[PDB]
Amino acid sequence: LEELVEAVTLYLRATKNPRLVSADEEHIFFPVLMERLNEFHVSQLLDVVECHWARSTLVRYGTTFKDMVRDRIALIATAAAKSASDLIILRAAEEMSPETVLRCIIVMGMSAGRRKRDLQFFQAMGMFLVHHINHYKDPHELVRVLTAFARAKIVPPKRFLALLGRRFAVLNKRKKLGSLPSYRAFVNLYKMGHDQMNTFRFLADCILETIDSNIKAEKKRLRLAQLQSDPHLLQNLRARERFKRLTELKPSMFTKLLLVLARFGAPHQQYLRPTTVPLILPTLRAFPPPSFTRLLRAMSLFRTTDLDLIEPVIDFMADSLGPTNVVPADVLQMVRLVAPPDVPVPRNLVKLISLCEAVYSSSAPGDMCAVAVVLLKIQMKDDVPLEALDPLTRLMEFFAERMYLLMKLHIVSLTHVDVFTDLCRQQQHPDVSGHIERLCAERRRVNDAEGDDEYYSQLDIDVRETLHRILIVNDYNTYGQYRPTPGVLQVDFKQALTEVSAFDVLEAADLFAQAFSNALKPAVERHLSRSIIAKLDGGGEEVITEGNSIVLRPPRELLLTREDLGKFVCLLQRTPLRRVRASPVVWRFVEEKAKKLGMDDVLRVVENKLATAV
Amino acid sequence: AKTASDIPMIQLCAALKCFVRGLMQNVETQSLDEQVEHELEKEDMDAFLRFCVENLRRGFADGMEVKCVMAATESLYQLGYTSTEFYEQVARYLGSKCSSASASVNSSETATAVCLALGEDILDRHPDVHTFLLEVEKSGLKGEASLSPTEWMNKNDPANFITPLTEIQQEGWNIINRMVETRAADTEKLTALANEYVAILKSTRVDDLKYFFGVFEE
Amino acid sequence: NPWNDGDAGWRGAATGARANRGRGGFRRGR
């Protein structure tokens, strides 16, 4: 037994290098061990299991090995339970030990996935861990157990997680739990649907006590010392290092913790006020824009009304970020944050208004509607001078003219126009330019002449949905191209483009170009160009089915009439897609269709475009 | 501090009195290290006191009795809140209520301590508040400073139903319930039950009479 | 709000402030 155990452990530890994985040796060893594992103790089996497993070795012999040892461990544990109520079953009580259960959880948790046998086995060891929980004294082992369960994608019973949290509470005195393991446990418990708020309260307390202890330690060091008695990039790095030293966590994860606490309804006084001065303020400059947005939404949900935090953030955004660099979403979130009447008025509201004007005038629907609502909320306050609202009046007139343009294009929904008109009516706005009156007259003509039905029949629903999805992908919070667009969003956009014909997509792209100039991202333009090229190439399109299998769908026969193809040529001329405009395949297909239909001017244009391309 | 939302002013004052009464004993401080820790705890205490004065300002906004503001200022000075702006608001509020107040209801010891707590410059700016505090401390109530926080809450604000009932109070409530269940026509049983109630009226809650009289109405 | 966890607290407590905002006459009696 000992010789075979040593040999198999030596081979398993030698299999760390992929060059040392051999088929002959594994074929010699694994079945011989397979037939004799009924003579092996649970400790020996776990020692064999714990050694490193090669991927090929795991797929060829590892999975069945683990399943059989799991079955044997379940059998010996059942025998031990019956006793409490190859001679190994006779001594099953001693073999099944709490340390054995803990190491089994740690090892098989990170090695198993979403399987039925794994689920049953894990439920068995969870019941046995409930039986032997009280013996463990290091909460880090429980944290590792929770992480293993999270990897396994299996949710134990709620009472089990409550017991684990109570054990965390009990064991924390003897051995304090670190802030990073506390964060990991918090994420795991939130992901596995643990509703009980007490564990979240305890974990937040465990994080905050460590943070304030470190802050007090540095302050007492400074006080004892005094009793005895690119530069921007460098400052950002130093601030990040200080924050990581104090909180033992990256700023993004701290901000997402704060956002989670805000979502769960925790008070702002006990979780933002203590950390505002030492943590948030000095590290604010080095935050990534995603962390900026998360923190802004955290303050919004927390209903924070402390100018001590509000004013420096506005000062940083106005003087250290610049209007061109700050995403308008964060600016809108800040304006909503200062909107509520209970929020005291900061002394630098004019800076925020000027930044809003600069950002929303340099760039060039529902967004304008919400902007108008929050401007109304700001104007409701009596501490706002009229002259400071004078630029906001011009902003609202700009929005009115933009709606004047959108109503002519039959793109904007009339409900948003009604909401905007109601806003201007309840604001008693001084419509000096009169564009609001012209908008109301055009809305009256819409309601009287054609109606909403004819207005919505002016265009195609497919084009509208393609435009909406294109705008959503383009307006996704990439935070100034800081983060690449998600692969899941890429797949969703590709699926949306696949189900829609090329002509509708081109019409949507032309409408987007007309409405917004130079507002299309390079990635979305490349995606649209690839979709159109694949559609018109004749080689088919790659579609990801419900089984996640790539299938070559043949291109749909676009039955284009003479007028329809002339419109297609016009859209090709007016599209912002340079690749599509210069694509020889599209022009060749248009030439073929023109030859089949028999028009001469389109043929001449296609010939000239092909000559220029070649 | 965590579970403090929509705090009645009386309950906040009672909690402040409890915090004051549980203050640590003062000993000679080692000037090297542990006095630094003393200041380190003092700043946290001051932050908690700032959280408290937030609700104090809220209570000023909605409206509070003079007894509540006097007790809150007493406790805040005893713990230590040297802002000199909140005290200006306190003096302003007392000046607002100076005419519509009675010196025969407030506490003399509280008046002396709050007059000491409020700076002489603040009283110089507000003379009517100074006269009112002088009148209260010269003529008022004595003995309300040594009362336990629960006794202070009960005497100051009845109908709180926070502390558990004693045996005599529970017996009185049982008598009230049995009177309620009894029919109106049966005058003898009601007379007997009322006579039983008034035999222990001294040891029962004063506010509970509002229920007792109600039976006579129903 | 999940953080409340089925605890009305001071808004649903027995304090005199909450007991002084109703006009029933206290006739039937609790």
Coordinates of C-alpha atoms in Angstrom, one line a residue, chain B residues 18-148:
Chain B
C18 CA -27.6 57.2 29.0
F19 CA -24.4 57.9 27.1
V20 CA -23.5 60.7 29.5
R21 CA -24.1 58.5 32.5
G22 CA -21.9 55.7 31.1
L23 CA -18.9 58.0 30.5
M24 CA -15.5 56.5 31.3
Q25 CA -13.7 57.5 34.5
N26 CA -10.9 60.1 34.2
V27 CA -7.4 59.1 35.3
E28 CA -4.0 60.6 34.9
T29 CA -3.0 60.2 31.3
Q30 CA 0.4 58.9 30.1
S31 CA 1.5 61.8 28.0
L32 CA 3.5 59.6 25.5
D33 CA 1.0 57.2 23.9
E34 CA -2.4 56.6 25.5
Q35 CA -3.4 60.3 25.5
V36 CA -2.9 60.1 21.7
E37 CA -5.4 57.2 21.8
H38 CA -7.6 59.3 24.0
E39 CA -7.8 62.0 21.3
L40 CA -8.2 59.2 18.7
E41 CA -11.4 58.0 20.5
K42 CA -12.4 61.6 21.1
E43 CA -12.6 62.4 17.4
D44 CA -14.8 59.4 16.8
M45 CA -17.0 60.5 19.7
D46 CA -17.2 63.9 18.1
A47 CA -18.2 62.4 14.7
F48 CA -21.0 60.5 16.5
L49 CA -22.1 63.7 18.2
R50 CA -22.2 65.4 14.8
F51 CA -24.5 62.7 13.6
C52 CA -26.6 63.4 16.7
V53 CA -26.7 67.1 16.1
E54 CA -27.9 66.4 12.5
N55 CA -31.1 65.0 14.1
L56 CA -31.1 67.9 16.6
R57 CA -31.2 70.3 13.6
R58 CA -34.0 68.2 12.1
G59 CA -36.0 68.5 15.4
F60 CA -35.4 72.2 15.4
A61 CA -36.9 72.2 11.9
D62 CA -40.0 70.3 12.8
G63 CA -40.4 71.6 16.4
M64 CA -39.5 70.4 19.9
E65 CA -40.2 71.3 23.5
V66 CA -37.9 73.5 25.5
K67 CA -37.2 70.6 27.9
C68 CA -35.9 68.5 25.1
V69 CA -33.6 71.1 23.7
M70 CA -32.3 72.0 27.2
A71 CA -31.6 68.3 28.0
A72 CA -29.9 67.8 24.5
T73 CA -27.7 70.8 25.1
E74 CA -26.8 69.6 28.6
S75 CA -25.8 66.2 27.3
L76 CA -23.9 67.6 24.3
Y77 CA -21.9 69.9 26.4
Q78 CA -21.2 67.1 28.9
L79 CA -19.9 64.9 26.2
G80 CA -18.3 67.9 24.4
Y81 CA -19.5 69.5 21.2
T82 CA -17.5 72.7 20.7
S83 CA -19.0 74.0 17.5
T84 CA -20.4 77.4 18.7
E85 CA -22.8 77.4 15.7
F86 CA -25.3 74.8 16.9
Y87 CA -25.4 76.7 20.2
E88 CA -26.3 79.9 18.3
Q89 CA -29.2 78.0 16.8
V90 CA -30.2 76.8 20.3
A91 CA -30.2 80.4 21.6
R92 CA -32.2 81.5 18.6
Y93 CA -34.8 78.8 19.2
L94 CA -35.0 79.5 22.9
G95 CA -35.5 83.2 22.0
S96 CA -38.3 82.2 19.7
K97 CA -40.0 80.3 22.6
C98 CA -39.0 82.7 25.4
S99 CA -42.3 84.4 25.7
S100 CA -44.4 81.2 25.2
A101 CA -42.8 79.2 28.0
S102 CA -43.2 78.6 31.7
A103 CA -40.4 78.5 34.3
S104 CA -42.5 76.3 36.7
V105 CA -42.2 73.2 34.5
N106 CA -38.5 73.1 33.5
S107 CA -35.5 71.8 35.5
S108 CA -33.4 74.1 37.7
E109 CA -30.2 72.0 37.6
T110 CA -30.5 71.6 33.8
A111 CA -31.0 75.4 33.6
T112 CA -27.9 76.1 35.6
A113 CA -25.8 73.7 33.5
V114 CA -27.1 74.9 30.2
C115 CA -26.5 78.5 31.2
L116 CA -22.9 77.5 32.0
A117 CA -22.6 75.6 28.8
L118 CA -23.8 78.5 26.6
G119 CA -21.1 81.1 26.3
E120 CA -21.4 84.5 27.9
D121 CA -21.1 86.2 24.5
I122 CA -24.1 84.2 23.2
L123 CA -26.2 85.3 26.2
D124 CA -25.0 88.8 25.6
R125 CA -26.4 88.7 22.1
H126 CA -29.7 87.2 23.5
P127 CA -30.7 88.8 26.8
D128 CA -34.3 87.4 27.0
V129 CA -32.9 83.8 26.9
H130 CA -30.6 84.7 29.8
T131 CA -33.5 86.1 31.8
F132 CA -35.5 83.0 31.1
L133 CA -32.7 80.7 32.2
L134 CA -32.1 82.7 35.3
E135 CA -35.8 82.5 36.2
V136 CA -35.9 78.8 35.6
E137 CA -32.8 78.1 37.7
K138 CA -34.0 80.3 40.5
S139 CA -37.6 78.9 40.3
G140 CA -38.4 75.5 38.8
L141 CA -38.1 71.8 39.5
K142 CA -35.6 70.1 41.8
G143 CA -34.7 66.4 41.8
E144 CA -35.1 65.7 38.0
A145 CA -31.4 65.6 37.6
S146 CA -30.8 62.5 39.7
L147 CA -33.6 60.5 38.1
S148 CA -32.7 57.4 36.1

